[PDB]
Amino acid sequence: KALPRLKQRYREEIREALQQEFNYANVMQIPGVVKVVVNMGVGDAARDAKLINGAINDLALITGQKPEVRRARKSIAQFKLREGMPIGARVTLRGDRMWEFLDRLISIALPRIRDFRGLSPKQFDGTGNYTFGLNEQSMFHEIDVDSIDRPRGMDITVVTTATNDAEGRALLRALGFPFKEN
Amino acid sequence: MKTGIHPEYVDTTVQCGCGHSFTTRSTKQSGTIVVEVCSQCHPFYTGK
Amino acid sequence: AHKPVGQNISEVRRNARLRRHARLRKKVAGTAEVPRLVVNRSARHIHVQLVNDLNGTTLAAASSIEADVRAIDGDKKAHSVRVGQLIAERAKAAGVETVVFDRGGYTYGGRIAALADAAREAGLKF
Amino acid sequence: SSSRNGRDSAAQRLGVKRFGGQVVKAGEILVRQRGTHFHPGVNVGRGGDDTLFALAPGAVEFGAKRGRKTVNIVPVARP
Amino acid sequence: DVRPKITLACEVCKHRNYITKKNRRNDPDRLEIKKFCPNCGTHQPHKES
Amino acid sequence: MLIPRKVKHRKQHHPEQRGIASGGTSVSFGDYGIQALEHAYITNRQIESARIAINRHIKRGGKVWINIFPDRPLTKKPAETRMGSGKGSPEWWVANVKPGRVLFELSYPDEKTARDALTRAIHKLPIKARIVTREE
RNA sequence: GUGUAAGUGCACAAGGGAGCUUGACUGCGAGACGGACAUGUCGAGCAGGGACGAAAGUCGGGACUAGUGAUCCGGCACCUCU
């Protein structure tokens, strides 16, 4: 009935491209994306919790599902951080919602970064997943720039069924990732 | 998918200054979102 | 040469069911007069046994494998209901009227839910 | 010059009160213990303070299961 | 006294039935508890006097 | 003067002197060694006086290994005190030595000087000891 | 990691989280542990009336062992006693 284009792209072109270049023994070893999770660490909530309420709504409008406020599980005195206080918010994306986020970030959002220069291809994790962080939330279209109070950044990491880095880098770069070339 | 706890998800279309059009969903209540620079527009994606 | 890195979901689900079936088995046990009714559920069928844990022997069994249940035009719950009746009649033919229910580590609802009450109405007092 | 020590509690008389091979009535206390060193088996019930006792008459018999010490009661045969 | 002894009276027959303790600073208000009223023979709400 | 940096318990029962050594009965590092023959608490200072004695005779070359470490404390009550009123404060550190234990091991090119040097160390130890080499 | 000292325990969790709730009950208690005596401790189970659970079932405070004071004298409420 309905089909996201990037998933339509992955199923049709990307899936065969990976198979041809990596010559898999079986079809099920084709690497796909599993989920994309976005978290933002406040850290300044150790003093004033008002920032946490501001951080929650930013992610909710960014993605499409309200964050899960993350209590702090350690009491560190130097941070003036106590047990159980909210310190970060995280959003998990599965199903069609990754592609819509993944496409909207690739095509529109990522070019909108101030003096955008690309992302290093060595930001992998060794197991075949990518992580990379940001510094501002005003970049997104869905957040009104007047409504912002302070640039709070946010981290995006993608999890793929790839095992090694080459398989992962093949998936994301062929998916349209503006990788830097070292 | 919990009923009311989530922001309302709006079906929208992306229109850019180069004439490129995209179809997706988003949070934007207007239901239609415009953009000045897209992936095709962005020089970095074109090698420029 | 493919070396899988992480746990496969099938084994994570399989191990978790076994872990949460043991904690169920702490209190539930069967006896020659009150046999434990073990339930096993799969994406295509369902199985039940009457187990007497004193010596670890099975009194009666039923499953969606039998073509009689397969020929049921209904749904998976409709197959489950047919299974629930089948084990009950086999139970009375073996001389038992009261059992305990080992839900098997699955959350009691849906297909299992249809299984338990179908046998309950058939005369299995539990 | 003085000692700051010298305080002690009473001796609680723990231990295994009923040993293996003994005939016990219902409710007799088998082991008086603090933790679950000995774990209940068949026809052996656990008290509030992890004291073990017997729910059915019979003969004690210590056993093991899954690497855990257990205490059981075998139903001695009526004459 | 932080944890002063309190007594519970049945709401119906006003019999002072049970006696417990509670943290007055944590729960300054009176206590709402359902308990077995012996003369009534049925669980009735109990009010701390 | 070897003392432990820290010890879990500072006041301890006297180490018992029964039996003979089960471990460390054979020279492992050096070529010669001193083997005990009687039970006695080899204290902290006696080790220092003996180790210095070895170094003075062998002069420059060679290495000395001390397999005994005095980590067991011993206490004494303050002088001129009646009995009672608790245990005394720890005073000196001793290491319990049983017959067969090898205390020191010395490596040196020539045998004659090495045996003489170890002999001087023996005279600084309360126990009757003998010098034992590495081979069978 | 277990509110709290140490020890015995606990990963099957007694550890982390969530929903409902007040058994942190009434009348009793076979059989026992420990003891000079006085104290102290465990208790399956029955009945009434409940809580959670689909059910089996569990629940007479807390993972266990400390957090307390006999008798006389007197206060308060109830009782079909004098």
From Swiss-Prot, chain A:
Pfam families found in the cross-reference section: Ribosomal_L5, Ribosomal_L5_C
Keywords from the named record: Ribonucleoprotein, Ribosomal protein, RNA-binding, rRNA-binding, tRNA-binding
InterPro entries from the UniProt entry: Ribosomal_uL5, Ribosomal_uL5_bac-type, Ribosomal_uL5_C, Ribosomal_uL5_dom_sf, Ribosomal_uL5_N
GO MF: rRNA binding; structural constituent of ribosome; tRNA binding
GO CC terms: ribonucleoprotein complex; ribosome
Disulfide bonds: none
Domain of life: Bacteria
Family statement: Belongs to the universal ribosomal protein uL5 family.
Assembly and binders: Part of the 50S ribosomal subunit; part of the 5S rRNA/L5/L18/L25 subcomplex. Contacts the 5S rRNA and the P site tRNA. Forms a bridge to the 30S subunit in the 70S ribosome.
Protein's recorded name: Large ribosomal subunit protein uL5
Organism: Mycolicibacterium smegmatis (strain ATCC 700084 / mc(2)155) (Mycobacterium smegmatis)
Gene for this chain: rplE
Swiss-Prot record, chain B:
Binding site for Zn(2+): 16, 18, 38, 41
GO CC aspect terms: ribonucleoprotein complex; ribosome
Cofactor(s) demanded: Zn(2+)
Oligomeric form and interacting partners: Part of the 50S ribosomal subunit.
GO biological process, one term: translation
Domain of life according to the entry: Bacteria
Note accompanying the cofactor annotation: Binds 1 zinc ion per subunit.
Name of the featured protein: Large ribosomal subunit protein bL31
Function: Binds the 23S rRNA.
Keywords in alphabetical order: Metal-binding, Ribonucleoprotein, Ribosomal protein, RNA-binding, rRNA-binding, Zinc
MF terms (GO), sorted A to Z: metal ion binding; rRNA binding; structural constituent of ribosome
Family statement drawn from the similarity comment of this UniProt entry: Belongs to the bacterial ribosomal protein bL31 family. Type A subfamily.
From Swiss-Prot, chain D:
UniProt KW keywords: Ribonucleoprotein, Ribosomal protein
GO cellular component term, pick one: cytosolic large ribosomal subunit
Keyword Ribosomal protein set for record: yes
Pfam families xref list: Ribosomal_L27
InterPro entries on file: Ribosomal_bL27 (IPR001684), Ribosomal_bL27_CS (IPR018261)
Keyword Zinc on entry: no
One GO molecular-function entry: structural constituent of ribosome
GO biological process annotation, one example: translation
Similarity-based family: Belongs to the bacterial ribosomal protein bL27 family.
HAMAP family reported for this sequence: Ribosomal_bL27
Protein name: Large ribosomal subunit protein bL27
Biological source species: Mycolicibacterium smegmatis (strain ATCC 700084 / mc(2)155)
Lineage: Bacteria, Bacillati, Actinomycetota, Actinomycetes, Mycobacteriales
Chain's gene name: rpmA
UniProtKB/Swiss-Prot annotation, chain E:
Keywords: Ribonucleoprotein, Ribosomal protein
GO-annotated cellular components: cytoplasm; ribonucleoprotein complex; ribosome
Segments passing through the bilayer: none
Ribonucleoprotein as UniProt keyword: yes
An annotated GO BP: translation
Molecular function GO labels: structural constituent of ribosome
One Pfam family hit: Ribosomal_L33
Superkingdom assignment: Bacteria
Similarity annotation: Belongs to the bacterial ribosomal protein bL33 family.
Name of the protein in its database record: Large ribosomal subunit protein bL33A
